[PDB]
Structure formats: C-alpha cells, structure tokens
Subunit: 442 residues, 3 copies
C-alpha cells in the first residue's frame, strides 16, 4: 500500500504458512511496481517494511531482495536448543513443553546448495550496478534450518551441522546494511555477506549453525558487536577475509565452532573485549598476512567438551596450534586473559605442552601484558547438557599445568614480547626478538 507497510499474514492470495518466500517475493514485486520513479520531488524509492508476526512460516521459494531500504522484521528471535532436543531420546519427546523454535519463524524448506551455497539461502540479497544496494535491515525474527542431515561419518544426522541451508546471503557489494536482534538456528550457514561496507551485525543470537557469521570477498568499516554466537566443529563463528577497519567487540562466543574469530588477509581491524569459549585449539586465527590488528582485552577459555554426544568430536587441530595464532605483521596483542583447562592425558600430540599464543610468520608483532592461567582437570562427560556445561565452567579443582605462553616460530622475527609469560613460558630466539619476561615470585 501507499505507506509502504506490509504484513505477511495480511497479503492477498498469499499463505505464509505454506510458502512465506512467495509471499515476500510478491510484496517485493508490488513495491517495485509502485516505486518506479527515482527523482520525483527529491525522492521516490524510499523502500518499505515487511512485518512477520510471531508464527510458524514455511519458506519454499528463495526470497530475492534487490531494493535498497527494505526492512524485514518480526517480534521474536525465537531460539530453543534443537541440538539438545534431538539428543534427548525420542520416547521422551511427548513430555516436552515444546520441541521447535518459535517467534517470527521462517522454516527454510529448500533443497541443499551444491555444485554454490547461494541457492540454499532463505533470503538472497543481490543487485549489481550503481549505486551499491544500501541500508537493507533484518530485525528481530527467527530463521530455522529445521534438521541437520547425514554426511558419511558415524554421527547422528542431527549432529552433523550439514544441511546445505543459509539464513541470509548477500552476494553483491553493499553499504550500511543491518542485521539486528535475529535468531538463527540449525542452518549450515547462518549469515554470509560478501563485499560489505559499513555493515553492522549487532545483538543477534546465532547458534547451532555450522557457520555463524562470514564476511567474504572483501570489505571495510564494519562491525560485529554484542552477538551471542555458537557454531560447529567444521565451521566459523566469526570469519572475515580481506576486511579493513572491522570492529569485533562485545560478543559472547561459545562452542563449538572450529574457531571463534578467523581472519584471512584482514588488516587494520580490532578484535577486542570479547568473551571467547572453545573446546578446541585455534580459537583466534590471524592468517594469510593478517596485519596491523589489535587483539585486546578478550577473555579466552579453552577446555574439553563435557557433553557426551560431541565428546571426541573436534576441529582436527592439535594443542601446538595455539589459542591465538598469528601469521602476519605489525599486530598488537594486549591485555588478554587466557585460561587453558585441559586433561594432561587428552593433550595431542602425546606428551606435548600446549601453546597459547603462537607467531608462525610475519614481523613486528607486539605482544604485551597477557595473563596465561593453566590447569589440569580430568574430562568428564554426561548426557545432561546444560548441567554438564555449567558444572565444567564452574569447576576449579586442579593441579597446575605447564604451558608455552608464547611460541615464536623461526619464520617470524623482530617481534616484541612483554609480560606475557615467565622466561620459561616464552619460547623465542632472543637475538632477533625483544623479550621481557614476566617477573617471577623469587
């Protein structure tokens, strides 16, 4: 209508329970048809808002967004742990108050994306030419990939993090986009945004997805703030490639992504003031000439998976990789806390000492004022999920455990390492690196 407000439950000849995709595409076509003029009275393509009330909507056709200033919003992120529910024995399902996620819920009933993943996306944002598509907003709704499927391993289907489905895929260059207050669940990829400028991914709940946030191709001046993020052992929690000026702060990143923050070729960016929890090494990775980044005042925790269905599932990386791994130049690693809480039996390779910060290549890295705390605890598992997670998080009964605080590989040199471990805990060629050991008691 003329005021550009739409409700998917109030669309003529549209049934959002059967196919919300069709309904939203139909609304998009109506907006285009009504907003054909670009320069009438200094305006004419102001866009529109499409509202989703709380409800269970099945999406069977991909939504194509190719207009600037489109807001899609609901009234609930609607998360519940489908992982937990699928691992509760089936005979107990009748006793459960509810089984599925809710809120303003888009169920992605698309076939898988193979041979690229874009075709498995609920929402695809694509438009080439000039200007770059701008200020699209997604807010406060839920995107549910429903089931994970078998992939060839022995594992249960619902625990593979594989289904070919994506929540939102932005394929073209974009400016001033927003994703806020969303729920994403049970999607192989929650949110993939290519070629992003001044994007804000703020205050979402992105969990039980193979991969959560992926910033691809390149980008600039973006920020990932205030999110709650949990990915899968073969995927990324927060990933970026070729970004400049990215700010990653105030996220609570919990397991079980392969990593917490993964950068390839990321420069002049900040990963600061996050809480990072992982069950595997390689929590924060600065790869392929990631340079001039600040990694500051983050809380790193690495311990063992305490929940039986994923005990013995891992990211294929050994404890020599590091919690923080750097390949590149002129980074600053300041004021971080590292808690390494592992069973001395569970260490790989056999009889190795864990590495916390590892510099594999590059020059001029500044590492200063980082506190490393290490503890030996035996790795219990039980079937009761949140009970086991909270019991393991709060457990402080331990021997001490030896760790390498900072390892500088010979392929990295001219680094500066200050108060980030005792002389023992810093493994580095002193002739080509400035080292100041943390003073010990004596």
């Amino acid at each position: 209508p003329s005021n550009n407000r739409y409700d998917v439950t109030e669309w003529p000849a549209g049934n959002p329970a059967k196919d919300i995709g069709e309904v939203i595409n139909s609304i998009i076509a109506d907006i285009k048809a009504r907003q054909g003029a670009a320069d009438v009275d200094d305006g004419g393509k102001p866009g529109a808002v499409i509202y989703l009330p709380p409800g269970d909507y099945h999406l069977r056709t991909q939504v194509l967004i190719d207009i600037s200033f489109l807001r899609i919003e609901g009234s609930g992120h609607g998360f519940t742990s489908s992982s937990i529910r699928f691992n509760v024995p089936e005979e107990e399902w009748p006793d459960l108050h509810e089984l599925w996620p809710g809120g303003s819920r888009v169920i992605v009933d698309l076939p898988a994306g193979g041979a690229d993943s874009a075709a498995g996306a609920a929402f695809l944002v694509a438009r080439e030419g000039s200007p770059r598509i701008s200020s699209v907003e997604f807010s406060n709704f839920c995107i549910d990939g429903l089931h994970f499927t078998a992939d060839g391993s022995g594992r249960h289907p619902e625990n593979t993090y594989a289904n070919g489905k994506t929540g939102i895929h932005v394929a073209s260059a974009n400016d001033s986009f927003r994703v806020t207050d969303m729920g994403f669940v049970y999607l192989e990829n929650a949110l993939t945004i290519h070629k992003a400028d001044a994007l804000s991914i703020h205050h979402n709940f992105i969990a039980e997805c193979g991969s959560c946030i992926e910033l691809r191709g390149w980008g600039q001046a973006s920020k990932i703030t205030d999110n709650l993020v949990g990915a899968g052992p073969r995927g990324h929690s927060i990933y970026a490639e070729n970004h400049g000026g990215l700010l990653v702060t105030a996220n609570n990143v919990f397991p079980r992504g392969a990593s917490s923050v993964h950068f390839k070729g990321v420069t002049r960016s900040s990963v600061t003031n996050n809480r990072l929890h992982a069950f595997y090494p390689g929590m924060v990775r600065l790869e392929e000439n990631s340079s001039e980044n600040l990694v500051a005042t983050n809380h790193f925790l690495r311990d063992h998976e305490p929940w039986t269905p994923f005990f013995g599932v891992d990211n294929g990386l050994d404890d020599l990789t590091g919690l923080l791994s750097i390949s590149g130049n002129n980074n600053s690693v300041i004021g971080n806390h590292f808690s390494e809480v592992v069973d001395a039996n569970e260490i790989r390779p056999e009889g190795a000492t864990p590495v916390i910060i590892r510099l594999t290549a590059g020059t001029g890295n500044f590492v200063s004022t980082n506190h490393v705390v290490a503890m030996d605890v035996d790795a219990a598992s039980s079937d009761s999920c949140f009970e086991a997670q909270v019991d393991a998080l709060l457990a402080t009964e331990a021997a001490d455990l030896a760790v390498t605080a900072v390892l500088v590989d010979p392929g990295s040199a001219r680094n500066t390492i200050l108060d980030s471990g005792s002389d023992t805990q810093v493994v580095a060629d002193r002739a080509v690196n400035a080292i100041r050991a943390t003073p010990t008691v004596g």
Copy 2:
C-alpha cells in the same frame, strides 16, 4: 490469531485498572490456541503483546510460563522520582510533570511477603520440566514501583529503596532471554534472573531501584551490555553468582549502589570497559572464590555524595576495603583507571591510608598497568541535585593524596603486580609475590 496483541484492544479486563489481569488473560488465550507441539513442524511459536504509551496499574502478578513470549512497549519513560519526592510537596503543582511515563506498568502489589520476594514481582517467569523456558523478550517499556516506604531506616520514606516490589523475576532455568531498552524506576528489585543461560541485558535504563540487575543461583554464557545503571546504598548495581563466561561491558554505572559490580563464585568471566562511579568503597567485589576473571580497561571514580538528602548515607564500608576487592585465584586486573576523590578528614577509619586494589585471599592474580590517581577535596553538600552532581564531577582543583594502590593481604600469595604503583604504594610481601614498581621519575 496472528499472535499479536494490544492490551488496549482486549475484551476482558481493563489495562488502566489491572494490566496484569489483561496480560494473564492473553497468555491463557495463547495457551488455548497453541495446544499442540508438533503440527507441520511447529505449533507453539509464541506471541507478542504490545503496550501503547499510557499509565497502566498492575494489581495481579503476571505469570509467564510459555517460551517465545515478547512484551514490548513504545517508551522507557524514566524521570527522577527521587528528585521529585525530595522537592517540597508545596512546589509539585509547579512541575511540568510528576511521574514516569512511556509504556508504564505501575506496580500496585503488596510487599514481597514471608513466603518469597517472587510474589512482589510484576512479571514472574516460571515453568518447570523440560525444555528450559526460552527466548522470552522484554523490550522498550517502563516498570515503576511508584513509592519507596518506611522500612525502619529513619530516612524519609521516599529515600529508603524499600518496597518489596520486583520488576521482572525469572525463577526457572532459562535460555536465550532478552531484556532490552527497558526503563525500571522505584523498585526495590528491578531485574532478578535465576539460572540464566545465554541471557542478554542490553541497553536498558535501570535507575533509582534498590537493586538493579541480579543474576542468581548460577548461569553461563550471558551478557550485560550497554546499560545505564543506578542502584541504592544497601543493594546491588550488577550482581552475579556462580556464573561462568559472563561478559559485563560498555555499561555506565552511576551511584548509589553498595557496589558497582558484585561477584560471588563467578569464574572465567569478564568485567571490562565499563564506566563506574560510586560514592562508597567496595565498587567492584570478586568474593567467594571468584576466579579467572578479566577486570580490564574500566574507569573507576569513587568520590563523596554531593546531594544533601543522601550526604550522610553510606554502604557501611571503610576506605581500607578497596575500590576493587578480590578473594579468589588467577584473575587478571589490567589497564584500569582509578580516580579516588575524597576529603582526607572524612576518611574512615580516622587517619587511614585509603586502599584501591585489595587482594584479600587467593593466589596467581595478575595486576598490571593500572593507573591510580588520588585527590583531597572539600566535601560539599547541596539540595540542587544535578547541579551539584555535575559540579563535583568537573572539579579537579585539589591536592595530591597518599594511597595504597595495591594491598596484598598475607592470606593472598603468589600474585604478580606490575606497573600499578610505586614500592610505597604497593604493600605486599615481596618474598612470595612478584612486584615490579611503576618506574620512578629519572
């Protein structure tokens, strides 16, 4: 039917008389319409209940016992009832307004009795069995407890921070809850959440409540971000117990709580990048084996109350307590700024050297690169509230004051203390602690 309600558009009850009866009725209708858990891959998506701006009296506790329920308004509606009530009653006809506004829930309940304080809660979220109640959302409305009452403290009744009333009380284990954009005023307890997993308390205005945010029992992976917080002298600003992986960041905490942030049993969490202003000692307390927490890049200011009605009111603690007090192991205290701005005469006990960081118990704590700044100022009093608060904040005309930057009690040992004060400013056994004094001039 599309799961969207408006309290001013419901047949039963009257939102102005009893908004609680109206909301409970809506919840009954949601339960009556959403009776099945597995029809076409959903069936309990929840709902949204809207509070237009208005003055709504609540006489019946609202019981929330469904997942995916959102309650939202169009206004946080704060004004300082505290100021208003300390303006002579004679002048109240002269004021543009007297009460809070916005989407306002006026809590007219009787006091939280001899059974429990949960019965004083405007909103009680509780459900037992499985799964945990999930993704309930509270957004952009006001909860006003209207008056404080005499509690046997002899201060004017409106200044007691006592009425047995709670804003939102969550009694059961919960997952993915959200409290955003809210206003809480004149409640003995604004927000008390038991047993929270992955909670977010984001961008709220929680002021002039006896206690503001309390995370009780236990929890994991939650976050308290971007909030404006002001509590009362016997209560908590931000409190948490047996939490693992909590992130408290980007909050502006102003007086006059007993504390700014108070932890009991909290592990592997982060209190980073907050602004903290207190009128008393014990601003940040890590108690009862609170271990492996990062306390980083916060700004602490502790000065004297300038407002006459609370001039002589305090938290009962003496200047030897600390601005930051730690009882626990392996914590990291890094990059914090401490401004101590007191009258030297009023220092308690008399002639004491005020303590700033105090390590009362535990081992392995890392205290590095903290800037202490201490000042002696004449403590003024005034009835013109915000005038006197701003003046006090801006006044630096002052003499330099001797303080103990870090005090390690004999019961704490093997701590590391770098660049957080001179040798005189650090009181500690050097034989069992590693101390490097901030380098001196020259």
Copy 3:
C-alpha cells in the same frame, strides 16, 4: 486515543509536503489530551509518533516540549549522497536510485541564522523550568539535509559540508534521552545535545554530515556506543564539552572529520574500544584541562584521502600535531594501536618527523603499552570512492617510516611513559618524566 499516531493517518496537512506541521499538530493534540499531572498516579505518559517508510519534506521546525515522546520509523535509509553528487549530473537518470530512503525526513528549512543554529534544526527539543525534560526517544528513521551549498571555499557546492541544517538540536537540560538506530545524512550538524544527563546515543548511522555528534554546555553519566560515524573536515565526529563520566566505546569512526573524538574540559570519562580512521592529524584531542580520562584499546589508523574530490582537502593541521593530543592532568592512555600510513613526500612541515602521541600540557598522565607502527606508502587517488577506500585500507606494500611515538612538550611534566616506543621514538625530558623505553633488539 491510546497515544499512538501514524503521520500518514493524520487528518490535517500533508506529511509528503510538510511533516513538521503534521508532527507539531500531533504534539498539540497530545498536550490537549494530557492536561493533568496527578490523576491516578499518572497523567502525562507521552506518546509515540510513527513514520512509515516514505519521503517526507519538512518545512516547519518541529518543537518537542513534553517528556516521554517517541518518534520512530522503519528505516535508517542511508545511501551515499556524497558519491552520487560526484557522479556527473547527466548520468543520474540511469542509477537505480539517487536519494536516501527508509523513513525519510527531508529538512527543507532555510539555512540557520548567524546568532543560532537551533533555528535550522528539523527537531528542536526545548522546555525550561522543572523537572528537566526526560526520556524523549528517536529511533530507526532517516534525517536528510538534501544538499550542501557554496560557501566561498571554491570546492564544488555538494562537497562543502555546509547548509546551516541540523537533524536534532536539544537546547535544554535533559535526562535519559535516547537516540537509536537512526540514519543522518547531508546535514551541517547531525545531532547537537546541550546539557545531557544519562544520554544514550546508540547504534546510529551518522555519516556525511559537517559535524555528527556534539555534546554541548555540560553533561554527565552519558554514553555514545556502537555508532558508525563519518563527518566533514571542518567539523567534529564526536565532540563533548564539560562532561564528566562520558563513556565512548565500540564506535567505528571513519573519515573525514577534523577529528574523531574531541574533548574540551571533559573529565573522568572513557574513550575506549573504538576503531578510529582519519585522513588528517589530530584524531583524538583532549583540550582545555581534559583530566582523569581513560583512552584505552582503541585502534587508530591515520592515512591519506584516496578519493579524488577530497584528495587535496585537509583539516589545517600538520604532522607534528599528533594523532592523540593531550592538554590536561592525570589521564590514562593504555593499550592503543596506532597505524601511521603516509607518504614521506606529503609530510608537513617538509622533512618533519610525524608525532603520534603529544602531551602539550598538564601533569601525571600515564601512557603505557601502546604499539606504534609506521609505514611509507603512496596511497594514490581514484575517482571511484569505495574502490579507492578498500585498496588503501588493505595495502601494506611499504618501506619503514621514522616517527615520534611520544612527544612530551616542556609545558607538561611528571608523566609516566612505558612500553610506548623506543628511546629514539620518545622525545621527552628523562629528568622530569618516568620513561621506560620499549625493549628493542637492535
């Protein structure tokens, strides 16, 4: 009425022609209906005014003089008018769109007078007497000043950053105000707030405005969080005067303000965890006795404008000014990263050594653990804006550059400077300051 208004459903006037007349008409209707302040514990709860997506010319200033008024939209609606206005005019018909959109207020007010810029403000919040106007809210709409105009500078009219228009001007003392999710574009001033208490400016997109955020007169306990900010070269990005307890964090500030953050007489405030990018020196300025401030874990990038229309334009300041410049007492500068990426041939004065941190006046400042990285690069020009910006942000093809990491002027003394540069990099009197050089290997 339930205090909910829609500007496209109002009987008088035309929001496409004059949204200001419509909104003022709604405001008068609120005041007429809410005449009493103490009827049933309430009476003036305020209201919400909703702007659907659309193009709305404003010709009459809106005057807001009631508490608890919320003005909300469904789109921040940013597009780069700057890019578009530097596309040849004859090509404009073939662009997908030209203008900003979303919920768009176009400010068609004639330029603000010499005496006061409040008269060029689209929204003016102003009311004297007691109490202070409280809890006004601006959310998720777009304010567009449309054109920049010729100002004598000889630059193209659309690149001058001058038109005497303001988005939102608050003249009067205020409490608990909130400005969230907005889009501001093409205004000489985006947001000016006098005398702010407990203000939150959160998650806004404030770009291509002469000045973006200015907190004037005085203020306290306020915060500026999670904003994307780009100003003009004669203006401020974030500015504050006579504030105490200001928290500035998690903002991604891009060019091209005269500065990123500028304080005058600001005390006991925190400028922490921001990503700051400038094309000019003088990025962060603490002036006129800015004391007891924390400036921590920011990422500073300074480089050369790469977009042709502004390639020769600067803020008037030379490379001896410093990226961070301090005039005041007892500040803390901890854990920041500075990238200085400039052409040796374009340094001014000729063959000067660029300064990174400058202490011009005051005593007791603590500077610790700052990583300075400096590079000789030739950022060339391109006519294609977002292309030039990404290329320059990711280029490290770069020989090394000598810089002064910390300069202490003789008018400042008794500072402490640790691990913030080598002995060559610290230009300061060793007799009167405490200096620990960053260890080097040599």
